[PDB]
């Protein structure tokens, strides 16, 4: 691919060839609490998934995705922000090269381990993914801060995945799986329109960002790291990290539901 997380070809660079990349609506951004505006005509979030729409996990060379089947509505999410119903497709994480910092979207300035990103896509508008990803109302991503500390159980089946898509392109089934469970117990949380963190940037994501937290240790972290960008039989080169710097809210308004 032409772009990464490398010096060259990272995300400082990715305006060359994709210049949405300095758009009105980039993701991910600083939230700052003292700037939200609570909106009393925001729902509850909703999500019904089904264990069986769980499909296959895959080294995409910056990371790794689950996929899920996305051909009928029995994984969903509603309320919240959304009038429309979003069908899962997708959740992966993003990270980085240590502790400190790692987590994409950061509130009042502070930086998490980690992120996780459930996406979800307009399927009472759309027809499918591709044509729903470059609609303004075309995708849903809830993000999940990730802060280091306590190993996550949860996050099991998911670790003791990767040992089989240790390199760039494998790819393995990874069925009966709730993403559900790896939320946080409350599910308040803070919206804004925005875009894919990496490319092709659509601006085509109504981003839903939980309140709290949840945990994941050194170790588990360093399992993400263990992933390699490269293919079989090249030398080894680890996902040190794969987390987009926040960019300008450019008049964006972030609205809380508490
Ligand atoms: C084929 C496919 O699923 N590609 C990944 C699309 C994609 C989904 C979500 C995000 S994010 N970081 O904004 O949550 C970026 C890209
Ligand atoms: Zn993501």
Same mark, same amino acid.
């Given at each position: 691919?032409?772009?990464?997380? =490398? =010096? ?8 060359? #060839?994709?210049? /949405? ?8 951004? =600083? /939230? ?9 005509? @925001? ?33 969903? #999410? ?5 009038? %429309? ?22 509130? %009042? ?31 849903? *991503? ?15 089946? *998911? #670790?003791?995945?990767?040992?089989? /898509? ?19 117990? !409350? ?7 925005? !875009? @894919? ?11 839903? /960002? ?17 992933? #390699? ?30």
């Amino acid at each position: 691919p032409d772009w990464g997380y =490398d =010096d060259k070809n990272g995300p400082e660079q990715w305006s060359k #060839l994709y210049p /949405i990349a300095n758009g009105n609506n980039q993701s991910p951004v =600083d /939230i700052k609490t003292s700037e939200t505006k609570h909106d009393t005509s @925001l729902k509850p979030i909703s999500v019904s998934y089904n264990p069986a729409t769980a499909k296959e996990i895959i080294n995409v060379g910056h990371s790794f995705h689950v996929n899920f089947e996305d051909n009928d509505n029995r994984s969903v #999410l509603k309320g919240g922000p959304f009038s %429309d119903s979003y069908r899962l497709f997708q959740f992966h994480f993003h990270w980085g090269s240590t502790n400190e910092h790692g987590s994409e979207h950061t509130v %009042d300035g502070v930086k998490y381990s980690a992120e996780l990103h459930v996406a979800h896509w307009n399927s009472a508008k759309y027809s499918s993914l591709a044509e729903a990803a470059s609609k303004a109302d075309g995708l849903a *991503v809830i993000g999940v801060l990730m802060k280091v500390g306590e190993a996550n159980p949860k996050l099991q089946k *998911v #670790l003791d995945a990767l040992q089989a /898509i240790k390199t760039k392109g494998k790819r393995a089934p990874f069925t009966n799986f709730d993403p559900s469970t790896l939320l946080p117990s !409350s599910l308040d949380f803070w919206t804004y329109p925005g !875009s @894919l963190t990496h490319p092709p940037l659509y601006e085509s994501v109504t981003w839903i /960002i939980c309140k709290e937290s949840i945990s994941v240790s050194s170790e588990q972290l360093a399992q993400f790291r263990s992933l #390699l960008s490269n293919v079989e039989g090249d030398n080894a080169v680890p996902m040190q990290h794969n987390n987009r710097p926040t960019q300008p809210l450019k008049g964006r308004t972030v609205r809380a539901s508490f």
